[PDB]
Amino acid sequence: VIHVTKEVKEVATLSCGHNVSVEELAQTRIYWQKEKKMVLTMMSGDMNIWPEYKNRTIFDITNNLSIVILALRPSDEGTYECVVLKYEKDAFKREHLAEVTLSVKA
Amino acid sequence: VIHVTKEVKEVATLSCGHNVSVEELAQTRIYWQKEKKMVLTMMSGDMNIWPEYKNRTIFDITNNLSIVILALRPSDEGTYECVVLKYEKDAFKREHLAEVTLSVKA
Amino acid sequence: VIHVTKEVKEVATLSCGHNVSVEELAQTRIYWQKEKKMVLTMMSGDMNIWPEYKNRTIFDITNNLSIVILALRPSDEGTYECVVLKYEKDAFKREHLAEVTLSVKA
Amino acid sequence: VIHVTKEVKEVATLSCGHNVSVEELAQTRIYWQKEKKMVLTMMSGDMNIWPEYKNRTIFDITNNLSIVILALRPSDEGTYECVVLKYEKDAFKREHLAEVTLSVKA
Amino acid sequence: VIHVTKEVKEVATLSCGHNVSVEELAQTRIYWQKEKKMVLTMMSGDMNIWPEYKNRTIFDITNNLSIVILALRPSDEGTYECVVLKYEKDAFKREHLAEVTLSVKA
Amino acid sequence: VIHVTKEVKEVATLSCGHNVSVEELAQTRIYWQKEKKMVLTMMSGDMNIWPEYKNRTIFDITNNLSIVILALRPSDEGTYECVVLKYEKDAFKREHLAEVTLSVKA
Amino acid sequence: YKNTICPPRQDYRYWYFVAELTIGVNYDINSTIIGECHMSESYIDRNANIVLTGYGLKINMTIMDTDQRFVAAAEGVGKDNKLSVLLFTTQRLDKVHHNISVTITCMEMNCGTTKYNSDLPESIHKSSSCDITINGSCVTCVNLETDPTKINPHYLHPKNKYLYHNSEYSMRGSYGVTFIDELNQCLLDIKELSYDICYRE
Amino acid sequence: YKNTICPPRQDYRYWYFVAELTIGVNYDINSTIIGECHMSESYIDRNANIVLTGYGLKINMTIMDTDQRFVAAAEGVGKDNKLSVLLFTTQRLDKVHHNISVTITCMEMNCGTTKYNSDLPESIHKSSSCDITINGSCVTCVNLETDPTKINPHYLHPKNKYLYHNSEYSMRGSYGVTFIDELNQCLLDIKELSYDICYRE
Amino acid sequence: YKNTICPPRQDYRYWYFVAELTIGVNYDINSTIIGECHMSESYIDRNANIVLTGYGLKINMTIMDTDQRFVAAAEGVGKDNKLSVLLFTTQRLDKVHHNISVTITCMEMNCGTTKYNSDLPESIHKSSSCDITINGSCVTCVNLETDPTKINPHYLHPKNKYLYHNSEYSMRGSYGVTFIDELNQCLLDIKELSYDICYRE
Amino acid sequence: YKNTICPPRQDYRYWYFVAELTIGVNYDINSTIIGECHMSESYIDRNANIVLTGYGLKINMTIMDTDQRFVAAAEGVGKDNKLSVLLFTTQRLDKVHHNISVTITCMEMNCGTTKYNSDLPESIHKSSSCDITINGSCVTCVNLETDPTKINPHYLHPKNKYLYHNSEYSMRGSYGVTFIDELNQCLLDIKELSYDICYRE
Amino acid sequence: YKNTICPPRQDYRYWYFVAELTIGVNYDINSTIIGECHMSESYIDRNANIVLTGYGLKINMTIMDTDQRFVAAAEGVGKDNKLSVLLFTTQRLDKVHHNISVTITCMEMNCGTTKYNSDLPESIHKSSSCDITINGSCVTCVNLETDPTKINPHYLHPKNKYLYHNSEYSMRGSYGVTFIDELNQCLLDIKELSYDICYRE
Amino acid sequence: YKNTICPPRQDYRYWYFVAELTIGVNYDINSTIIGECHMSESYIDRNANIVLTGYGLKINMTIMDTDQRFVAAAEGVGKDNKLSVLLFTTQRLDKVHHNISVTITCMEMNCGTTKYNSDLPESIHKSSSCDITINGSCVTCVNLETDPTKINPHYLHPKNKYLYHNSEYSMRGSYGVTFIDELNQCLLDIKELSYDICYRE
């Protein structure tokens, strides 16, 4: 678990720690969620996104499959778990559940 | 069962349907009764008779062991059963229970 | 049982129906009692007698071991039982329990 | 199941979908009923008919053993089941239970 | 049991009925008691005595191991038991429990 | 158990009765306690001491591993137990639980 | 296809009133006792035999050459020591009279060997006979009304059971014998009559 | 046809008062105890034997050459230590006196071997004898009134049972022996008398 | 991978409404009796057989070449002596019609050998037949609605059990025979209808 | 004719106060415990032996050459640890003193082998001896008053039982031993004394 | 000296939260049933196997090369047919990840042979794998959170039992598979969740 | 004559406070549980061994070359996980110190092979040693105060039992070991201490 700390109202990268290839990205489902509340999904190459986090997150796939949180707020503080699944034998096999915690200093 | 019908205030024969001989009549007990209420008895040749039917019945033994009801009334309407028993082995053996029904038209 | 009947105020013999000899009388206990109430005893030749019947009874041993009731009254009416026992093997063996009934006509 | 739809106050054929011959029609019992309420019977060649549907139905045996509903009303809307039985071994054997539904547009 | 009777205000011997020798008296415990209330003890040759009976009893050992009651009173009337024990195998073996009864005539 | 008695406001030695060497004293835990309330500890050569008894006790190790109680008071009266443990097989083995009782005369 | 008798059951709910048996006794019976009657039934070679023991009487009634087996019995005590027995079979498959043999042994009072052992002809239609054998002098009269038109009014039918009785005069047969000059006083007073269902049915 | 005795039953409801047996004892019995009397009956070669143990007495009464078997017994304690035994058989088939043998062994107090072992002639009609044997000195008097005219008034007959007693003086026989000078004080005071029905009937 | 039938259980909680069986009888049945129906199930060589005995009828229904075994049954009595049987299996693995053989033996009234023993074609889709054999004259009509769309409204499903029923008209098959001129009055009045779950499920 | 002892019974109601046995113990017993005493009796070759275990003591008392067997026992605890034992036999057939052997083993406290094993002569009439053997040091004193004139006042006799006690001074024999200087303090205070009837009588 | 596993006990009071197993099913389960889950445990050759049958699922979970044996299990039903299984062992002697094999056979609905039979790598630390085999199509998703940091808040621990759970993120391993496009909706709503302790622990 | 030990009994009422055994454990025990402790006693070749299992500990204490057998035990749980064991034998026949061997195996938590297995000399009078063997790492401290002067004040002695304890300092021996730096905190707080009597005494 990576306790990344970062100052308020700043671009905030959250590393998933798992590298997926762009050919494999169509067959791999990636989604981020904090405190069991969903944040963004990348289901079969579709970058769907939640209304709480539509306009302030940018997915950088190459840099450890990360989200960059723009204009970070204390409401965004918490534990983000990054979930990655791969399609095997007509079943999505979960392969990554890395948890990172973001703390807000103001 | 013989449903004999006959007009009011008339001589009324009621056939028992069993013929007994006069030598056998001393050894044979015959009695008539309507609705389990006794009418006449011929016990060992003694023609005993009930106070309801003393003066209006005549036993004709030869004509099928019958009673003739004189001045018949609607009170006499009902089912008459004729019971005949014979003495065998120090026991009276019942041999006839013919039932006839008399109806009164007025 | 002897139903002896006899007129009021008369000498009244009550037969016991058992004859005992005078040699055997010393070894034989005789007593009379009416309605379980004792009348006279002849225990080993002693003619003891009850206050109700002291002066009106005479024991005649020979005439069937009887009592003679003098001036008989309706109070003396009842059933008298006469009890005779003989001494056998250090035990009095009862040999007579004849009951007679006296009726009083007045 | 045939969902036949037809406009209000019009002649309305309801196909049973089973063809019976006129020699077999005497041995075959045909009856129509909607919502378990009986409509017409053709029992042994007798075209008996119910008071709700006496004057507005015509049985056409040849055209798939049908009823023609005259002056159709929304009360006639519902599911009609057509029941056909044949006499085999002293028993009426059911051989057809086709259901058609009539809808009324007004 | 000896029912000794004796007149009031008189010297009164009470026999124990057991004779002990003076050599054996040191090894023998003798005590008198009336109605389970103790009177005198002679434990190992010590003539201890109770306050009720200090000055009116004299032990005469030779004359059947007795007490002599001086100036006898009706309070002294009762049953006196005389208890004698001998030392055997480190245990006092009871050998005498003679009871005498004193009656007072006044 | 030694019942040492000594007058009030006086130096008061309390003998433990166990002699330990100064090389062994580093490996041996000694502590005194009265009525289960702790008095002084000598844990691995550290002479720690309780606030009730800081300034009036002096440990003399050589003279039977004793405490000397200065200005003794009736509050110091009681039973002192002296507990000595030695380190064997990664375990402190208790080897002395001598109890002495101090009485105060005033 | 021919109608048969069913295989036997532990409990039967379809009872058919086959016979009204009335036995008068000289020894005293006060009233009906619950659980007194113990009946045993057997259907062997088309013969229905019922053996019921109660109130000092063992009654062995056998119906011969029949297609119905007994199901139940009910014994009640009337006034003047009359004992009324109601008997039940499965159903009336055939409408014919059947020969009967009823053996009535006195098992408690007035006790002995066979006293009558005779044949009672049925008085109505004369198509059947009762070979009735009495082992004792306790029995005063016997009246056996088979296939009775009228069920006794104070016989309470058990619940979940169904009673059927013959309603035709052409089917009822009466067998009667009286051993004393009683003028067939087997007719109960029925005033204090009660009925108890037998055990082992 | 001859009247016989019925086969034995577990429970008998027709009781016949056959004998009033009264035994006086020197040892103390206070009052009747419920369930004290235990009786055992046996009918072997026309001999009816009853063995009842109660209140320190075992009474073995045998009636010889008889057509009736015992059914029941009732034992009660009267004042002055008199013990009253009421005995019951099936019914009186024959009107004749029967020879009896009654063995009265003291099983609890005053205990020993045979003390009397003699024959008591019946005082009325002199047609029977009681071969009475007492094993002990506890018995003071014995009065055996067989076929008694009068039933004891404070004997409560059990319900669903029927009592019959002899009403003829020609049938009652009294057997009596008294071992002390008692003038036949076997006659109970009957004031505090109660009766308890025995077990194993 | 292919869907199979599970190994049998002592108690099944997933019931599938497979058949609505209605049998009319001439003998009288009053109303539903709790605990009357006793059913026995057997799945041998892909054949699901259920034998339920109740209200005087033993019904032996066998579904041939099927992947579902019976789980439960419910028998209720309607007005005019109509007997309604609700039958349940595990689940509908295959969506095909199956040949059935239902044997209905009258075990209590109107009792005999085989009366009809014929094949009823299913009226809808004509893809299956009922080889129905009636041992007796008690049966008046038989209506077997297999895979019914509508569950009977007054059938109370047991708690902790789950009911599933077919909702497709393409799957329901009706087998019908009437032995009297009844115009298929197997249709119950359903006013006083109650249902009791069978035993040995 | 000679008076004998009766055959043994399961329960005896005629008890005879044969002996007042008092045992003092150094170990503490508080008060009487209901159901504590368990006694076993045996009459073999005219010897009556009773073995009663209670309150830490097993007492084996044997009366030799006697015609009476033990029936019952009662054990109670007095103040100052005195244990009072009341013993009962059938009846006193012979008026003679009998030699006794009483074995008192301490089974719970102060436990060991034979400590005294000596003969106590009876103090009154000197006609019998007690061969008394103590297995342990628990016993402080023993007082055995045989055929006592006075029954202990707070011994409640069981109901339906009858107590008889000797009333003659010519028959009472006292056996006494005290092992400590106690001046025969076996005499209980009797203030808090209660008695419990033993088991297996 | 090395820490070992204790010999097995009948009842264990020290429970360790080893795994949070969640299984989603397509067939309907309403709510938790008390006494539904029946578990069987076996520790053979350092392998802890637990077989728990409940709510139509038989779950055979085996932890390989381990020093802890299972003690208990708790099965609860959540909303949207999610089934939550809480599993307990003795204690965590070694702080290492263990290879697991969990076999989930559908025993009541959607029943068949092996459907997936594959290896799920643990998502955290990638040090262990779940060889998971599903016998049927009933299972929709499986989430196995081993050594969970957080105990389910509405799991009521039994009294006289002691719960210990892992508090380190370095020890928790999550195994997950979803067979439908469910986005890992194995996460229960937990609003109506209840837990029942299994049998045969 | 020499004082011996009595034969064993089912229930003993004379208890002697022989040892105050206190065992501290690192795993958590909340409070005393009624019926938790199960003890087994054996006196073989003058050696008194007691094996009591309770609160996750099996304690096997053997006193060698002694004339007293164990009678009872009482186990209680104090604050800070201290476990207090009170042990009882018959009586103190000899006034000498005895060599002891106490084996304390952890049976539920912190479980393993022998950890210490050493000899603790008694601190007072140095006349005996405790060969103490601990099978596990659960035990933190052991204090064995044999023949204690003071009974624990909140130990409720059972009724009808008698407690005796040693009152001499010359007889009490203390055996102590602490495995952590605890300064002999085996001394319980005793505030919430309760005691439960063990089973199989």
**DSSP conformation letters of G66-89:** -S--EEEEEEEE-GGGEEEEEEEE
Contact at CB, F93 and L177, closer than 8 angstroms: yes
Closest partner CB to I177 (pick from D31, D36, D93): D93
Residues of D within 8 A of I185 (CB-CB) are none
Q: How far is CA I57 from the centre of its chain?
A: 12
Beta-carbon contacts below 8 Å between D and I: 48
Backbone angles phi, psi at K171, to 5 degrees: -110, -15
Q: How many CB atoms lie within 10 A of CB K105?
A: 22
Q: Which pairing describes strands A92-105 and A2-7: parallel, antiparallel, or unpaired?
A: parallel
Residue L123 one-letter amino acid: S
Cβ <8 Å between L107 and K6: yes
Inter-chain residue contact D97 with I123, CB threshold 8 Å: yes
Q: Does chain B reach chain G with at least 3 CB pairs under 8 Å?
A: yes
Whether H160 and G33 lie within 8 Å, measured CB to CB: yes
Rg (CA), chain C: 14
Which chains does chain H touch, 3 or more C-beta pairs < 8 A? C, G, J
- In one letter, which amino acid is F11? V
Chain I partners within 8 Å of G160 (Cβ): 33
Q: How far is CA K35 from CA B72, K39, K53, K158, in A?
A: 86, 11, 11, 14
Q: Which chain J residue has the Cα nearest residue L9?
A: J108
Measured in angstroms, the resolution is 3.0
Nearest CA in chain G to B96: G123
Are E43 and E33 in contact by the 8 Å Cβ rule? The answer is no
Cβ distance of B94 and G176 shorter than 8 Å: yes
Chains J, L: CB contacts within 8 A come to 32
**The total number of residues written for chain D in this structure:** 106
Distance CA K1, CA L113 (A): 6
Angle among Cα D73, D76, D77 to the nearest 5 degrees reads 100
Nearest by CB to G28, which of H12, H160, H162? H162
Q: How far is CA C66 from CA C16, C22, C41, E5, J81, in A?
A: 6, 14, 12, 61, 76
- DSSP character at residue G10: S
Exposed e or buried b for every residue in I46-60, given b needs 16+ CB within 10 A?
eebbbbbbbbbbbbb
Please answer yes or no on whether J14 and H56 come within 8 Å at the CB atom.
yes
- Please, are residues B92 and B85 in contact by the beta-carbon 8 Å criterion? yes
Burial class (CB within 10 angstroms; exposed 0-12, middle 13-18, buried 19+) of E75: exposed
Contacts of residue L44, defined as CB under 8 A and 6 or more positions apart, other chains included, come to none
L176 interfaces chain F, CB cutoff of 8 Å = yes
At residue H147, what is the residue type? D
Cα separation, J96 vs C60, in Å, equals: 54
Residues in contact with C105: Cβ distance below 8 Å, sequence separation at least 6, in sequence order: C5, C6, C7, C8
CA distance C55 to D30: 122
Chain H residues with CB under 8 Å of G112 CB are 1-4
Is chain K in touch with chain L: ≥3 Cβ pairs within 8 A? Answer: yes
CA angle H134-H136-H139, nearest 5°?
A: 70
CA distances from F58 to F3, F66, G97 (A): 20, 8, 129
Q: If DSSP codes are grouped into helix, strand and coil, which group holds residue L60?
A: strand
Q: Print burial letters for K129-145: b (CB count within 10 Å at least 16), e (below 16).
A: bbebbbbbbbbbbbbbb
Q: How far apart (Å, rounded) are the C-alpha atoms in residues A41 and A26?
A: 13
Distance of CA C7 to the CA centre of its chain: 19
Closest to J28 measured CA to CA, from J191, J176, J112, J140 = J140
J81 near J28, Cβ under 8 Å? yes
- With CA atoms as reference, the chain K residue closest to A96 would be K123
Instruction: Please tell me the number of Cα atoms within 13 Å of I15 on its side-chain side.
Output: 22
Cβ contacts of G187 on chain B, cutoff 8 Å: 36
Give the 3-state secondary structure of residue F95.
strand
Give SS3 for F25. helix
Contact I113 G6 (CB under 8 A): no
Per residue, the 3-state secondary structure of I107-172, as one string, reads: CCCCEEEECCCEEEECCCCCCCEEEEEEEECCEEEEEEEECCCCCCCCCCCCCCCEEEECCCHHHC
Q: What is the Rg, in whole angstroms, of the alpha carbon atoms belonging to chain L?
A: 16
Contact indicator for H75, H19 with CB cutoff of 8 Å: no
Shortest distance between the Cα of I176 and any Cα of chain D, in A, equals: 5
d(CA J144, CA J178): 12
Strand boundaries in chain K, DSSP class E: 14-25, 38-43, 48-54, 57-63, 70-77, 82-89, 100-106, 111-114, 118-121, 129-136, 139-146, 162-165, 173-178, 196-197
Scan residues 116-175 of J and list those with Cβ closer than 8 Å to E.
116, 118, 120-121, 123-124, 143, 169, 174-175
- DSSP letters, J17-68, are EEEEEEEEESS---S--TT--EEEEEE-SS-EEEEEEETTEEEEEEE-S-S-
Phi-psi region of J125 (alpha: psi -120 to 50; beta: other; left: phi over 0): left
Question: Which CATH code is given to the segment(s) H14-197?
Answer: 2.60.240.20
In chain D, the DSSP E strands lie at: 2-7, 12-14, 28-34, 37-43, 46-49, 57-60, 66-69, 78-87, 92-105
- Domain, as residue range, for F76: 1-106
CB proximity D33 to I under 8 Å: no
Q: Quick check: do A and K touch, 3+ CB pairs under 8 A? A: yes
**8 Å CB contact of K3 and L111:** yes
The count of domains in chain A is: 1
Cα first-last separation, chain D: 23
Quote the minimal CA–CA distance from J92 to chain L in Å.
37
CA nearest neighbour of L164 among L10, L12, L1:
L12
Give the closest-approach CA distance of I172 to chain G in angstroms. 34
Cα-based distances in Å from K20 to H117, K16, K41, K173: 95, 12, 17, 10
User: What residue has token string 């009844």?
Assistant: I182
Experimental method: cryo-EM
Strands of A1-106, DSSP E: 2-7, 12-14, 28-34, 37-43, 46-49, 57-60, 66-69, 78-87, 92-105
Interface-testing mutation among J2, J3, J6, with chain H (most H C-beta atoms within 10 A): J6
Name the nearest CA neighbour of K26 among I91, J102, I179: I91
The CA distance from B24 to B45, in Å, is 10
* Stretch 155-194 of chain J: residues touching chain L, C-beta under 8 Å: none
> B43 to chain G: nearest residue by CA?
G183
Shortest CA gap F87–chain L (Å): 9
K112 closest CB neighbour out of I2, I14, I162: I2
K129 by DSSP, 3-state: which? Answer: strand
